[PDB]
Write an enzyme that holds these catalytic residues in place. Structure first.
Site, mmCIF file in Angstrom:
data_model
loop_
_atom_site.group_PDB
_atom_site.id
_atom_site.type_symbol
_atom_site.label_atom_id
_atom_site.label_comp_id
_atom_site.label_asym_id
_atom_site.label_seq_id
_atom_site.Cartn_x
_atom_site.Cartn_y
_atom_site.Cartn_z
ATOM 1 N N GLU A 334 0.821 -1.196 0.000
ATOM 2 C CA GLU A 334 0.000 0.000 0.000
ATOM 3 C C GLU A 334 0.859 1.251 0.000
ATOM 4 O OE1 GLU A 334 -2.715 -0.877 3.267
ATOM 5 O OE2 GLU A 334 -3.251 -2.640 2.063
ATOM 6 N N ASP A 358 -0.577 -5.582 9.143
ATOM 7 C CA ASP A 358 -1.605 -4.802 9.840
ATOM 8 C C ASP A 358 -1.735 -5.317 11.255
ATOM 9 O OD1 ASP A 358 -2.033 -4.808 7.024
ATOM 10 O OD2 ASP A 358 -3.987 -3.913 7.334
ATOM 11 N N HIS A 524 -0.287 -0.160 10.700
ATOM 12 C CA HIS A 524 0.850 -1.004 10.305
ATOM 13 C C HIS A 524 2.044 -1.086 11.274
ATOM 14 C CE1 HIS A 524 -0.717 -0.725 5.910
ATOM 15 N NE2 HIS A 524 -1.214 -1.791 6.515
HETATM 16 C C1 LIG Z 1 -8.487 -6.059 2.361
HETATM 17 C C2 LIG Z 1 -8.785 -4.694 2.947
HETATM 18 O O1 LIG Z 1 -9.972 -4.142 2.344
HETATM 19 C C3 LIG Z 1 -7.610 -3.776 2.649
HETATM 20 O O2 LIG Z 1 -8.001 -2.981 1.524
HETATM 21 C C4 LIG Z 1 -7.321 -2.883 3.872
HETATM 22 O O3 LIG Z 1 -8.099 -3.252 5.005
HETATM 23 C C5 LIG Z 1 -5.953 -3.115 4.411
HETATM 24 O O4 LIG Z 1 -5.191 -3.950 3.945
HETATM 25 C C6 LIG Z 1 -5.656 -2.291 5.652
HETATM 26 O O5 LIG Z 1 -4.654 -1.331 5.331
HETATM 27 MN MN LIG Z 2 -3.058 -2.712 5.530
#
Ligand SMILES: C[C@H](O)[C@@H](O)[C@@H](O)C(=O)CO
Ligand SMILES: [Mn+2]
Ligand SMILES: C[C@@H]1O[C@@H](O)[C@@H](O)[C@H](O)[C@@H]1O
Ligand SMILES: C[C@@H]1O[C@@H](O)[C@@H](O)[C@H](O)[C@@H]1O
Ligand SMILES: C[C@@H]1O[C@@H](O)[C@@H](O)[C@H](O)[C@@H]1O
Ligand SMILES: C[C@H](O)[C@@H](O)[C@@H](O)C(=O)CO
Ligand SMILES: C[C@H](O)[C@@H](O)[C@@H](O)C(=O)CO
Ligand SMILES: [Mn+2]
Ligand SMILES: [Mn+2]
Lengths: 587, 587, 604
Positions: A334, A358, A524
């Protein structure tokens, strides 16, 4: 990867007709001892031994200081260590370089005032606002004692590892691929941070570049073929959790396997270049972006259309692929550049790959009991954290590497064949959950072996202050198998899992595992093998980043000596004060 | 030495036709009690009693405040104390002088709101940024009770001693003789510090002046003759440790005895002038440099050629010579002006001479056992510090002065003949070690009696903050005689020794005796008889110098009342904040 | 070279010497390759090459050597080429950067990030490619990222394939180079105080923070006892001394003794004082730069010196009260020859006025010419001149003038006896002819010092600077809570009528050296009148150089973020980093203060 050196500066009493000549050898020896300690104990991310340079002579008067300075400039010196067994002048012999760390080791002997120089020269450093570390051994040593005592070695190596990290970041880039991902703070990239604090540049590529390189054949096709082959033999597609009408056909998934491999290749080539691309007549693309660290925006725009970044993210961070065992490429999901740098701190301090995750859930004991029936014991006794990235994680994060029959993450040159094989065996790759990623791809699923000592780390940007560091030492957990599976399936059983329990201290945000999570400043964390908290505190201080939260014991906190002048009682406040006043290295 | 006064300001309820008249005597009495407490308990460095001035009347309305102000201006008042048993107005009755300390003592009675004025008037002080001390007794007293309770006396006297110290420094000079000595930080003299913080001037003399005065006869020759005589009868030349070809002949050493005497005389005359010099027709030189404190650069240039400063340094700091018992002249080795001021704080707070010393070695118990066989017990149990100057030390530092059969350093007017004799007897003067001082001279060797309560003190300059103070209360040590001699001969048996153990607290840099040394901010300390930590904290706060390190118990910390508004929990940070904001007195 | 035992002794000739900071030249280019980049490579690398030629062929180091330039290992198109470049410069002793380009380049990808050195960017004013466009773009990134850079943009559109640097560009590149080099030359060197504070003079209370933060400089110090120690212990070259004594006897005319009758020294004493002052010279010189001969005579510690690019002798009060003064020393250190030959000067402050010394050094390093140290002694109004002499001033003296006259010493170069195209100048040592050295010596004598001020004795320097020489008077002052500020006054030395000169001289101190100075008035600020200029001078001292170097100093000061509180340079010559204009374009002064304020010194 460049090779920043440590400059060892042996200062001596300038008085001759007796004194200087009698100290020449003892002094020059301290330098050599230190050069040796470093060059035989530490290694660059490429596995080569660290390099030191000694001043061209001992330093008794300014012109010797100048020559030392002359030599270090052209020697790519990223920090200095002065060593002395005697009294020396001080402002006459001190290094004035304001942009690098400095340490003074003053021999704790009695014949000659070594400790007296140490404290004097550090006064000058404090007075002239050039932060320096002071390294003073507990026990009086004999004038001939050749050994570096244990307390001194610890301080020398902590310093050197921290200094080397600053040395390796300097003049490198962070590459953004895409920019802001789903309004995530750390993905709103702040070049001032990189430039002012890390001496780093910012490079930037729209994800369309990925498509471009794919359509136009801008990658190594001999490499693609060897990779397809390797991936089929080594990478196991995991269970597809997708609802009926979203499940992809076997053809389509196979096409996507090819795609995400190509993605991995392009990411690598972007970060560091590839001579092979010049051979194929893409001379420009071949140079890369000089990135020590990068990130991939991914969601929403890319992942809504094309296969997600999981594969690429996973393998960039993993210490092998179809080309063999290798350094990782520190890489952020991300495009969380802050997490990327967090990982990068950890990486340069350890030469080990880094978990991006996360901070998903805090599991209190009451909640585990309710949901599972189980009462937590041992390290999980006090609750724990579900660390789990939204699809990707270094395969070294399995914890399949072993030392003394315990799980570790190793520098790549220490990895065994069987260990690499084990990481592969204990990972599968479930298709991407297509409600979140219409474009598909394949996530990375595994469970990190438990009872592994780790540190969780996050840099946060605090408006009008700058970066602040948080550190959390702890251990991975193994849960009862029924317990794991209940908590997994309930969360995201398609992604990789690490159960983390931080060490509690009763101080600060470490009174309870909840308090840790409740004080974590982002969604994170970067997670490293090892308890490297003290190393991070030191690095932080070198870069003048205040540490807002840590569970390192106070006695291991090792900061430039002038921090004490901001206070000895309230270390945290003394720290903010010092960082505030000194500001970043490259203002 | 001037005579700064304390202004006692008796505030009263301005309402007449009853209230004011009924409080006149009680109020005026509080003033007198306080004037008396001070003038009978404290003395100026010259031994005369401290002087107070009361406001020309009680202060009920502004014009009385103005008259009080009028009177104090021409009365050389260096701090104020307001006393009241009743309610008074506040902004109407408060002293506005921003350049001096203020204290308010509000009688803790019930008939009339004395404590209510106290807190109100201090609110105004905080609101208008004029720091003031609040003095409130624990126990309700009777409206007629004439006594100053013990808690109140302690606060009144701490305040008064601290205030008097600021009073005595103001408008005096520091004299540098030479300038920077061997790159020592505190010898790179910072006039901004003196000017902004201490209200002090900087004077400066190249050491050539010394030679000049010697060649040209610019000193008292009747005095020289009486001094030669006195020195021969009283001063014992110590063992010469010099290697064969450096040992000076008896003629040459005798010439040097004459020289260093002349040095002592010239230093004195420089610091404070000498009418005798006008009589001999050196009318200009006779006025001196108005120095309350001075230092002598010494090494390297002077000491490489001419006899060193040890003798001069020693006797300037000692409370007698051929002219009789006397005030010391606070004087810094190596022109360490910061140590000089450290000594000066200590001196103005106690009216006792001051030890200048290098913090030479930390002796851990493990190291003593290894080197000597001995296991430390008692106060030395936890390790200790070798405090030892590179040649000179106040002879009062022997600790030969006695009270209740315990060793002390006394104000000069309390010294007995036998005590002075004892200091002399227990000191000899070894020739200077000529590898360090080709020019010769004679060092000062003695060992400070043990079990003497002391405070070690250092001011450090922290770039972009200013001065910070460190305080370390402890005790001198007596070691087993075999133990002392092993550690001595191994170090510098030609110089004076004090074995110091600081009080540990488990807080801050006082968890261990190592931690103390490891947090000491210079190679130098000023060491005073007495546990004067609380006094120093108070003085620090008056001068807005933050205290970075001390082992004074929190309950004795006494600061202007507005410090609490910067915080009550984190006293250290509250302290830096307050000092930061208020800045020095004479910005 | 290494000592047989420990550690360093002078290679040598001398120990510390003039450094060779390089200018790093960065040719930046468009990264695109399916034709474009290749098409620009040649024209681009030519720009770089020709700029290096311009600098190396025009500019010399203080030691007479051509300035050295480094080119990037390649044309710079994407970051990794910028990294290869930065990688090279870091080990090539680069004190400043010049980016050249004829085309569009990718700003932040191609820019130099060094925060501690100047950067100039020159964009070819051509039509074919967006050269200026890169120029503005990359300059914008410099201002956004707070890394000051200079913008060099030529007035007139040039043809692609013209390889001549236009005159207006040349002017800017060389002003930049000259100033940049002065920064690079000062850095890492030291100032040596001999003594410390002299008669309570501000600039003699030496301020290490200034040297460290602003100039990247160290502070060394010895007490003046070191001279006496060396004199008494023979720590100086005695073979040298004998040559010097003989040369001095031959070339140094002792001057008329003005002393009060009972203070006049005997011929025997004067002769001893002559030996003394020569040894003072040798010793001060040795202190600053070291001496291999000292090592040979067994004084290895001493042989090494104090790495001093500039230094000061406190003198008054306690030295000069006793021993001969430092006039002779100060004079010859700043003069470009002695018994040993024609020679660079050693920049040297009377009365340890370090700030004067730094002013001198600024001038020295911009020009390679030695420097006049003066008391700004008297402002002579036309009315006072008329009253005192009956003469009505005219030409450049018409509006009054300042009497510049140090309290004993001055560079013999400042006689103005060297010549070019009929006019009086001060030259770099390597351009000095025999006739000129000789002329200087012949137009100077050395009066016994005035023992009412200097009981110890010695000899002052006395001459009259030739009139009609363009000069710049310069002074750094320290402002509490701000830092250094710089004042500049361009003008001319004057030739007064002889009667007027002798009347004014003899009322003043005819024993010392004189420059009569008229600053160019502009009607602006402090240059409304000659009086206004003195009345706004911030110290009793000034540093005067040959030439009009005001614009060069302005560029220098912006580089070191030193504000200019007062200058008489025409506004169009003001050449500062491009971002200065983001701080304002009408009030250049305030903009300059805001910019210096915010950016601060190079090395805080
Ligand atoms: C799978 C989720 O919708 C992700 O887009 C998001 O929750 C993350 O990975 C959190 O940063
Ligand atoms: Mn994430
Ligand atoms: C499974 C892995 O595949 C490639 O990376 C090999 O080169 C490694 O050594 C390992 O066997
Ligand atoms: C030994 C000392 O010598 C002189 O200072 C005397 O005046 C003192 O009183 C003392 O006896
Ligand atoms: C006085 C003499 O002048 C020139 O002849 C120089 O070349 C000599 O070195 C000497 O300086
Ligand atoms: C004797 C020593 O060489 C001294 O010169 C020096 O160590 C000190 O006194 C420490 O400040
Ligand atoms: C003779 C005087 O004392 C001079 O030395 C004096 O005017 C100065 O030099 C001022 O700097
Ligand atoms: Mn010392
Ligand atoms: Mn002058």
């Amino acid at each position: 990867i460049q090779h920043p050196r440590i400059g060892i500066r042996p200062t001596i009493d300038g008085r001759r007709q007796g004194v200087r000549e009698s100290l020449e050898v003892q002094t020059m020896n301290m330098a050599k001892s230190v050069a040796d300690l470093i060059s035989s104990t530490l290694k660059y991310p490429d596995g080569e031994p660290v390099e030191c340079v000694i001043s061209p002579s001992t330093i008794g008067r300014v012109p010797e200081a100048a020559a030392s300075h002359e030599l270090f400039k052209k020697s790519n010196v990223c920090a200095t260590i002065t060593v002395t067994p005697c009294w020396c002048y001080g402002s006459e012999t001190m290094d004035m370089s304001p942009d690098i760390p400095h340490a003074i080791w003053g021999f704790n002997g009695t014949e000659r005032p070594g400790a007296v120089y140490l404290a004097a020269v550090l006064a000058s450093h404090a007075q002239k606002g050039i932060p320096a570390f002071g390294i003073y051994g507990r026990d009086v040593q004999e004038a001939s004692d050749t050994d570096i005592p244990e307390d001194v070695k610890e301080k020398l190596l902590r310093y050197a590892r921290a200094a080397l990290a600053t040395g390796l970041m300097r003049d490198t880039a962070y590459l953004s691929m895409g920019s802001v991902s789903m309004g995530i703070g750390g993905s709103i990239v702040n070049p001032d941070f990189f430039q002012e604090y890390l001496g780093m540049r910012n490079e930037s590529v729209d994800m369309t570049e990925f498509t471009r390189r794919m359509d136009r054949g801008i990658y190594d096709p001999e490499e693609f073929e060897r990779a397809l082959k390797w991936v089929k033999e080594n990478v196991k597609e995991g269970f597809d959790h997708n609802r009926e009408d979203l499940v992809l056909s076997r053809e389509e998934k196979d096409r996507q396997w090819e795609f995400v491999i190509k993605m991995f290749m392009i990411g690598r080539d972007l970060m560091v270049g590839n001579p092979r691309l010049a051979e194929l007549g893409f001379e420009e693309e071949a140079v890369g972006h000089h990135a020590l660290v990068a990130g991939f925006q991914g969601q929403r725009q890319w992942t809504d259309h094309f296969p997600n970044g999981d594969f690429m993210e996973t393998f960039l961070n993993t210490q092998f692929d179809w080309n063999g065992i290798r350094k990782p490429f520190v890489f952020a999901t991300e495009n969380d550049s802050l997490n990327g740098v967090s990982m990068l701190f950890n990486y340069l301090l350890t030469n080990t790959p880094q978990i991006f995750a996360d901070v998903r859930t805090y599991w209190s004991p009451e909640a585990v009991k309710r949901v599972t029936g189980h009462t937590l014991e041992g390290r999980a006794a006090a609750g724990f954290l579900h660390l789990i990235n939204s699809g990707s994680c270094t395969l070294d994060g399995t914890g399949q590497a072993t030392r003394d029959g315990k799980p570790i993450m190793k520098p790549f040159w220490e990895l065994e064949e069987s260990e690499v094989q084990a990481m592969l065996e204990n990972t599968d790759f479930p298709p991407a959950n297509r409600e979140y990623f219409r474009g598909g791809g394949f996530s990375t699923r595994f469970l990190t072996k438990g009872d592994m000592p780790v540190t969780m780390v996050r840099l946060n940007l605090l408006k009008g202050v700058g970066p602040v560091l948080q550190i959390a030492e702890g251990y991975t957990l193994e849960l009862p198998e029924d317990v794991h599976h209940t908590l997994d399936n309930r969360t995201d059983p398609g992604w990789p899992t690490t159960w983390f329990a931080p060490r509690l201290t009763g101080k600060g945000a470490f009174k309870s595992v909840y308090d840790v999570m409740n004080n974590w400043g982002a969604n994170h964390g970067a997670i490293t093998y090892g308890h490297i908290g003290a190393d991070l505190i030191t690095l932080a201080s070198m870069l003048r980043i205040p540490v807002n939260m840590h569970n390192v014991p106070e006695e291991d906190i090792f900061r430039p000596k002038n921090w004490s002048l901001f206070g000895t009682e309230d270390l945290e406040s003394a720290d903010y004060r010092a960082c505030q006043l000194l500001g970043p290295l490259h203002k």
